[PDB]
Swiss-Prot record, chain A:
Belongs to the acyl-ACP thioesterase family. Coiled coil: none annotated. It catalyses: (9Z)-octadecenoyl-[ACP] + H2O = (9Z)-octadecenoate + holo-[ACP] + H(+). GO terms for biological process: fatty acid biosynthetic process. This is Oleoyl-acyl carrier protein thioesterase 1, chloroplastic. One of its GO terms (cellular component) is chloroplast. The keyword Lipid metabolism applies. The gene is FATA. It is found in: Plastid, Chloroplast. It comes from Arabidopsis thaliana. Plays an essential role in chain termination during de novo fatty acid synthesis. Possesses high thioesterase activity for oleoyl-ACP versus other acyl-ACPs. Substrate preference is 18:1 > 18:0 > 16:1.
Length: 265, 264
């Protein structure tokens, strides 16, 4: 992978692996989510980071995802090359936004796109912080000044409020626990694991007869290594819509809320 | 990746990803197991397999792993390039063997090696079958004629019998269930998930202070999508462990294995 000529975005090609595909021999949305995470990490490395700034490392501050929104038109098949372009942007004092564009390497056609919202958080106290002006200047040199949105639209599906699923849920998957493969290099549960846990409560018939078009996921609380999660889903709706909720198996503490959109095959 | 000049083995380079590494910023043994599986698939595709041959498809026959043995000396760090070479061999009518050699792309040094034993099984009846003529001839053209072993040592760790763990186990991780990410393209639980489940019962103190050197795993029964597994471990001893995976309910054995860990 490499930064584009202007140094304001990063591109990388990925060959889809045998273990990265589902029943239709195309990449799973969890594989896509891993690739977006990987290309975002390589963008930070290529711009002199390791993705906290000098001031953030000093103040015990980290970036935490608040929302992830993925829209897929064509899932890359096993053996195909997918090119992903990613860039960052400052959204005032609220936080930062990272956008992604997925393309077919043989045709050059846009096969997918993603957007994510990141807020600052003190590593230790877990308290959210607004972006300090000094921190803003430290990464404005790596972001385009003019707005560049993967989801430009006037009232797009990436910026819409998600309601809370009410009991009883239509479907559920109970007793979900992360294993060591679900942890990242800092022993935190990987953001991609939450996507997989959300999709666990969608019935296998819907997964076998439909394809995932859109997924919007809000991160509320972090699942610990020793926590147990319940995944709940209710059909809200040729297309199918679902309302999702991840919560602690015990006290019902909310960890995630989301929505999925599926098109009939 | 590409076949070597003689067409009797396959090589592929892999750049280690951020999500593929553990706490020491080096690849997990599950990441290595996935890469060996990936390089074995690309070897089959490059030699004309769209690896169930043409005769096996007519007979509803598939290759199933009976044993996987991995020995790692140096785990590739995040961002490093690891080159893996893989080849196949016939072992008479018992089945086939696939070996792997892992190398550092910058130094050319051997950082790991693996071996696996595969037996034939009827897809439908689940009955094991000895390898017959026509089938042997079909893939003998892709295997070296002279013996080429990743573990040449006469009577080595990869060809040793594994005992059954007796109750009570020293450590345990119960209620393990596979999710859709644990399934392969044919909806079966992939062989790498079993490695992860075995390691779940090793205490976090051993994982934080030791490095995994050897893992030998025997596959006895397949875990279904709706099955629940219990992972059991006992220290037999460097540190040595005896492992057992079994159905949470009736205690049906699905796997047995051994791990060897070196102090950091
Ligand atoms: C804005 O969204 C988030 C904010 C903070 C968290 C954080 N991991 C957490 C852990 C434990 C308890 C509460 C918060 C996660 C998401
Ligand atoms: C010699 O090693 C094996 C033999 C057979 C199996 C197979 N998956 C299985 C599934 C269900 C019931 C019995 C066998 C796996 C390994």
């Amino acid at each position: 992978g490499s930064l584009t000529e202007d140094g304001l975005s990063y591109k990388e090609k990925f060959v889809v692996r045998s273990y990265e595909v589902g029943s239709n021999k195309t990449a799973t949305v969890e594989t896509i989510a891993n690739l977006l995470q990987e290309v975002g990490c390589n963008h930070a490395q290529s711009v002199g980071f390791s993705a906290t700034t000098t001031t953030m490392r000093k103040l015990h501050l980290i970036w935490v995802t608040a929302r992830m929104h993925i829209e897929i038109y064509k899932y890359p098949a096993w053996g195909d090359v997918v090119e992903i372009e990613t860039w960052c942007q400052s959204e005032g004092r609220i936080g930062t936004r990272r956008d992604w564009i997925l393309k077919d390497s043989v045709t050059g056609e846009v096969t997918g796109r993603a957007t994510s919202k990141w807020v600052m958080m003190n590593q230790d106290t877990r308290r959210l912080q607004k972006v300090s002006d000094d921190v803003r200047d430290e990464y404005l040199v790596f972001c385009p000044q003019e707005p560049r949105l993967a989801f430009p639209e006037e009232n797009n599906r990436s910026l819409k409020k998600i309601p809370k699923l009410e009991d009883p849920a239509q479907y559920s998957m109970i007793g979900l626990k992360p294993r060591r493969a679900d942890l990242d290099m800092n022993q935190h549960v990987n953001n991609v694991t939450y996507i997989g846990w959300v999709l666990e409560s969608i019935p296998q018939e819907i997964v076998d007869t439909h394809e995932l078009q859109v997924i919007t996921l809000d991160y509320r609380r972090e699942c610990q290594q020793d926590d147990v999660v319940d995944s709940l889903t209710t059909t809200t709706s040729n297309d199918s819509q679902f309302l999702h909720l991840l919560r602690l198996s015990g006290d019902g503490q909310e960890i995630n809320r989301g929505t999925t959109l599926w098109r009939k095959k």
